[PDB]
Amino acid sequence: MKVRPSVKPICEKCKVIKRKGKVMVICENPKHKQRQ
Amino acid sequence: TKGILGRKIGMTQVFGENGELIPVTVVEAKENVVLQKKTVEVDGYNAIQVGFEDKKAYKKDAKSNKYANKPAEGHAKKADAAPKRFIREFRNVDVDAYEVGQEVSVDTFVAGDVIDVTGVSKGKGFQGAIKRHGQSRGPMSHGSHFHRAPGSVGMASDASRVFKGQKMPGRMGGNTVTVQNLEVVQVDTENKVILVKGNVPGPKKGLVEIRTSIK
Amino acid sequence: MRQTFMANESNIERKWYVIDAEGQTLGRLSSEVASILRGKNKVTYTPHVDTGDYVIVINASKIEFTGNKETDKVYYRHSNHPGGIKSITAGELRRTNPERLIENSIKGMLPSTRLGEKQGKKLFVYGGAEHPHAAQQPENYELRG
Amino acid sequence: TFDGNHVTVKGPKGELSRTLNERMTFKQEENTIEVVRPSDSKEDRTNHGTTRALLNNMVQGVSQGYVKVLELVGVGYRAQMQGKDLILNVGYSHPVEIKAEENITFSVEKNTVVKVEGISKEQVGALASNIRSVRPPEPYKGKGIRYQGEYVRRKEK
RNA sequence: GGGAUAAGUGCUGAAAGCAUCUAAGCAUGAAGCCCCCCUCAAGAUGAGAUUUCCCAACUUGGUUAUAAGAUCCCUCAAAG
RNA sequence: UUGGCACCUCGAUGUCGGCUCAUCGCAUCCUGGGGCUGUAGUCGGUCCCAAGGGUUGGGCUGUUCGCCCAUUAAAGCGGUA
RNA sequence: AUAUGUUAAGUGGAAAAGGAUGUGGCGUUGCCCAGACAACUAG
Ligand SMILES: [Mg+2]
Ligand SMILES: [Mg+2]
Ligand SMILES: [Mg+2]
Ligand SMILES: [Mg+2]
Ligand SMILES: [Mg+2]
Ligand SMILES: [Mg+2]
Ligand SMILES: [Mg+2]
Ligand SMILES: [Mg+2]
Ligand SMILES: [Mg+2]
Ligand SMILES: [Mg+2]
Ligand SMILES: [Mg+2]
Ligand SMILES: [Mg+2]
Ligand SMILES: [Mg+2]
Ligand SMILES: [Mg+2]
Ligand SMILES: [Mg+2]
Ligand SMILES: [Mg+2]
Ligand SMILES: [Mg+2]
Ligand SMILES: [Mg+2]
Ligand SMILES: [Mg+2]
Ligand SMILES: [Mg+2]
Ligand SMILES: [Mg+2]
Ligand SMILES: [Mg+2]
Ligand SMILES: [Mg+2]
Ligand SMILES: [Mg+2]
Ligand SMILES: [Mg+2]
Ligand SMILES: [Mg+2]
Ligand SMILES: [Mn+2]
Ligand SMILES: [Mn+2]
Ligand SMILES: [Mn+2]
Ligand SMILES: [Mn+2]
Ligand SMILES: [Mn+2]
Ligand SMILES: [Mn+2]
Ligand SMILES: [Mn+2]
Ligand SMILES: [Mn+2]
Ligand SMILES: [Mn+2]
Ligand SMILES: [Mn+2]
Ligand SMILES: [Mn+2]
Ligand SMILES: [Mn+2]
Ligand SMILES: [Mn+2]
Ligand SMILES: [Mn+2]
Ligand SMILES: [Mn+2]
Ligand SMILES: [Mn+2]
Ligand SMILES: [Mn+2]
Ligand SMILES: [Mn+2]
Ligand SMILES: [Mn+2]
Ligand SMILES: [Mn+2]
Ligand SMILES: [Mn+2]
């Protein structure tokens, strides 16, 4: 997961969710994941 | 798991089947007898108390430790043994095989058995830092007035004490040391001697406790 | 110096009580017991002497925590050796030796003065449900409020 | 079939086996029930919806259990045993031990075709998550333990 | 070797008919965290345990020698 | 770090570099665990966890730096007057 | 202590641009049993 302060969906397949108390991207593309 | 007490007699060479030259320490274990069975029942934990070398007479009315005192008399007499001069526990024995009155004998250690050996470590006196922690000396020459002193002992005004770890001069020789993994090389049942591969920490005549290796 | 009772060692009696931690919050059982221990509960309270009663806290194991702190509340300790801090223990204290979790926790609510010290030595905490001290014949006591 | 025990809403299914916790503090309905959408009060609606979901997932597999299938897309493939699948998988230089009898878990052997064969989807999902854990689907020549019907993206050497 | 964990990988899962490692609940996972390994350690005043040893004369609580047991002193060293 | 300010010390708070001894932080040089990869393999890049331990001998210069010779798994960065 | 609500971060008990279906209130609106959101079947 790219680890960044900002979190937005990357592409129109992406979905945002909290998972440990942390907001995270779920784009399904292996090189498009995120977790603030 | 097994163990015996023994007096370190000293070092020799001995020869392997391959001509291999194996340094050996000669441990001697005449006369060890089990003296007490320590069960969880009474003692709270499991141990066999073995009494090493034999010592004199009775509550005989005299100066030395060589002669046993009434407390020892009664302790040995509960075990139908003559009074002994060294006594130690081994926890981590088989605690059930071992009935109280019996001898342990050298024959319990079989050749090629790998073992750990405890014993207190020779004895240097009050000693300087270079001898006791190996610390490099200061330069000689080049105008130095520093040779065998332990270094800076601390910080400036921040660590404004000397930290509790600090290492400096004093007594060297105490401290029990055990050394791990040494082969039994031979066992000489005729004189109760038992040969140990390598060197065990004693001075000489030091009591050492051999026990079955852990790990 | 008109009138003002001060309790002597002649003029004072010390009762024994048993407390069931099972079902209680750590801090609340702790503070209630501390006042019990200081005698701050009798009308004959007097500051320069140990006026308190004995407390045996029971089933220390069943003590509880409020927050998400079975894991989040660490106890530290330092060995006075360099870098020998010891973070260890959380509500792991309640797992092994909770007798100390309750003991030290209660004792941190008594004054650090030799009197307060003797006062702390009047507590007895057992994780199990069976004190040795039956001979002192403790009365069962219910947590107020 | 339609047989299940009850007490304190922690009751075993009568067929085969069960035992499970409830979150308690919730509205409950007999047989199939419903209302995954809302119940009781507040945003505890989520929790109760998970309760109905869990018990429903429980009853759904007790008569006809669901079983994940795992295919070994490589030149090596696991054999079989009465308590293990004997995963001599991929080409790591040793066979691995695996499997457990907990609840009910069947073996499988079909030349690179294996299956967990449990009851509830949680135990199956677990033992197969780990049966598939031993080697992974490396996305080139697609090799590796693979859940059946899994997307397996690839790329160019 | 065992236990718990991080980043991570997940399972089951609603909120949010789907989907989702997570909020309930589960599994996995590091030279690191705990136990294991080595030495110290009951002045742990919270002063622990086991085995053995000794055992009265006087008393207006105590008194005094003694016992088990040591030590002083003396010959010493593996100790200093 | 270079500074700004002039609050402690002018009836004195020794000062660069080295040497001796270290101790701590993590923004990790190596080693352990992973994600992405424009990751085939062998290597690597980059981020994430991790501070247990380790982290070299010389040529020139007072030097700290720096260049260089030769090795290393690596030749980490800072605090502690 | 009382009454009514909030907060689940030990926030309380250090910090910004920026970021998030975290929850609470107060409003305004467009599609809704003429069937809509979502899911599944047909280009
Ligand atoms: Mg970052
Ligand atoms: Mg996690
Ligand atoms: Mg000398
Ligand atoms: Mg709790
Ligand atoms: Mg205990
Ligand atoms: Mg103080
Ligand atoms: Mg567990
Ligand atoms: Mg003492
Ligand atoms: Mg006492
Ligand atoms: Mg003592
Ligand atoms: Mg003399
Ligand atoms: Mg030094
Ligand atoms: Mg970086
Ligand atoms: Mg480190
Ligand atoms: Mg160290
Ligand atoms: Mg160099
Ligand atoms: Mg070179
Ligand atoms: Mg490498
Ligand atoms: Mg350098
Ligand atoms: Mg440094
Ligand atoms: Mg604070
Ligand atoms: Mg600004
Ligand atoms: Mg803010
Ligand atoms: Mg809002
Ligand atoms: Mg709102
Ligand atoms: Mg309107
Ligand atoms: Mn040197
Ligand atoms: Mn001088
Ligand atoms: Mn000199
Ligand atoms: Mn100085
Ligand atoms: Mn584990
Ligand atoms: Mn679902
Ligand atoms: Mn004692
Ligand atoms: Mn009398
Ligand atoms: Mn005598
Ligand atoms: Mn001699
Ligand atoms: Mn400055
Ligand atoms: Mn000034
Ligand atoms: Mn001014
Ligand atoms: Mn002065
Ligand atoms: Mn001065
Ligand atoms: Mn870090
Ligand atoms: Mn790595
Ligand atoms: Mn370091
Ligand atoms: Mn309220
Ligand atoms: Mn805070
Ligand atoms: Mn903002």
For testing contact with chain C, the best of B155, B158, B164, B167 (most C CBs within 10 A): B164
Closest to D109 in 3D by CA, of D119, D94, D99: D99
State how far Cα D64 lies from the chain centre. Answer: 13
Contact B24, B12 (CB under 8 A): yes
Breaks in chain B listed by the residue before each, with C–N > 2.5 Å: none
Closest to C53 in 3D by CA, of C21, C106, C13: C13
Three-state SS at C30: helix
CA distance linking residue D109 with residue D81, whole number of Å: 9
Cβ neighbours for B177, distance < 8 A, ≥ 6 positions apart: B118, B119, B120, B121, B201
Closest to B9 in 3D by CA, of B199, B190, B186: B199
Tallying the residues shown for chain A, one arrives at 36
Three-state SS at C31: helix
Domain boundary among D24, D39, D65: D65
**Which CATH number does the domain housing residue D112 bear?**
3.90.930.12
**Distance (Å) of CA B86 to CA A35, B56, D53, D75, D142:** 67, 13, 72, 67, 71
CA distance linking residue D50 with residue D54, whole number of Å: 6
Do D26 and D42 belong to one domain? Answer: yes
Domain boundary among D65, D83, D115: D65
D154 CA → ligand 18 middle, Å: 27
Do D9 and D30 belong to one domain? Answer: yes
D73 CA → ligand 38 middle, Å: 80
Domain count, chain C: 1
Position of tokens 């973070």?
C87
Contact C65, C101 (CB under 8 A): no
For residue B198, is it left (φ>0), alpha (ψ between -120 and 50) or beta?
left
Do D55 and D102 belong to one domain? Answer: no
State how far Cα D65 lies from the chain centre. Answer: 10
Q: Which of residues 148-167 of B touch strand F (CB under 7 A)?
A: 149-153, 155-159, 163, 165-167
Do D79 and D48 belong to one domain? Answer: no
Domain encompassing residue D130: 66-157
Give A32's DSSP letter.
G
Domain boundary among D65, D90, D113: D65
Do D71 and D61 belong to one domain? Answer: no
Q: How many other C-beta atoms can be found within 10 angstroms of the C-beta atom of residue A18?
A: 9
| Phi, psi angles (nearest 5°) of residue A33 | -75, 155
D39 CA → ligand 37 middle, Å: 65
Angle at B133 between CA B128 and CA B135, to 5 degrees: 85
Residues on chain C bordering chain B, Cβ-to-Cβ distance under 8 angstroms: 80-82
Cβ neighbours for D68, distance < 8 A, ≥ 6 positions apart: D115, D116, D124, D125, D128, D147, D148
Do D55 and D128 belong to one domain? Answer: no
CA distance linking residue D99 with residue D124, whole number of Å: 11
Burial classification of residue C109, based on how many CB atoms lie within 10 Å of its CB (0-12 exposed, 13-18 middle, 19 or more buried): middle
Q: How many other C-beta atoms can be found within 10 angstroms of the C-beta atom of residue B78?
A: 12
Query: Angle of helix C26-38 relative to helix C99-107, nearest 10 degrees?
Result: 60
Do D38 and D115 belong to one domain? Answer: no
Experimental method: X-ray
Amino acid at position D3, single letter = D
Do D10 and D46 belong to one domain? Answer: yes
Do D43 and D78 belong to one domain? Answer: no
Q: Number of helices (H) and strands (E) in chain A: give both, helices first.
A: 0, 3
Three-state SS at C10: coil
Which residue's CA shows the smallest distance to C1' of E15?
D46
Record the tokens describing residue C46, joined without a space. Answer: 């007097």
State how far Cα D53 lies from the chain centre. Answer: 15
CA distance linking residue C33 with residue C122, whole number of Å: 11
CA distance linking residue C142 with residue B79, whole number of Å: 55
Do D54 and D117 belong to one domain? Answer: no
Q: Sort strands A34-35 and A23-26 into parallel, antiparallel or unpaired.
A: antiparallel
Q: DSSP of A14-26, one letter per residue? A: -EEEESSS-EEEE
Record the tokens describing residue B4, joined without a space. Answer: 């015996």
Q: Which residues from B are below 8 Å from C81, CB to CB?
A: 163-165
List b or e across D39-61, with b for residues whose CB sees 16 or more CB atoms inside 10 angstroms. Answer: beeeeebeebbebbeebeebbeb
Position of tokens 């290796």?
B213
Helical ranges in chain C per DSSP H: 26-38, 92-95, 99-107, 114-120
Record the tokens describing residue B166, joined without a space. Answer: 């600090």
Contact D52, D44 (CB under 8 A): no
Q: Which residues from C are below 8 Å from B163, CB to CB?
A: 81-82
CA distance linking residue D62 with residue D78, whole number of Å: 28
Domain encompassing residue C126: 1-145
Three-state SS at C135: helix
Do D57 and D124 belong to one domain? Answer: no
Domain count, chain D: 2
Chain D: touching chains (3 or more CB pairs < 8 Å): none
Contact D109, D71 (CB under 8 A): no
Do D71 and D14 belong to one domain? Answer: no
Burial classification of residue B15, based on how many CB atoms lie within 10 Å of its CB (0-12 exposed, 13-18 middle, 19 or more buried): exposed
Closest to B209 in 3D by CA, of B187, B179, B175, B188: B179
Q: DSSP of chain D, one letter per residue? A: ---B--STT---BSSS--------SS---STT---SS--SSGGGHHHHHHHHHHHHHHHHHHHS----EEEE-SS------SS---B--TT-SS-B-----SS------SSSEEE---SSHHHHHHHHHHHTTSS---SSS--SEEETT--------
Distance, first Cα to last Cα, chain A: 10
Q: Return the number of CB contacts < 8 Å for B and C.
A: 7
Burial classification of residue C100, based on how many CB atoms lie within 10 Å of its CB (0-12 exposed, 13-18 middle, 19 or more buried): middle
> Mind telling me how many Å the CA of B48 is from chain C's nearest CA?
30
Amino acid at position D88, single letter = L
Task: Determine contact: B70 vs chain C, CB below 8 A.
Answer: no
> Mind telling me how many Å the CA of C79 is from chain B's nearest CA?
10
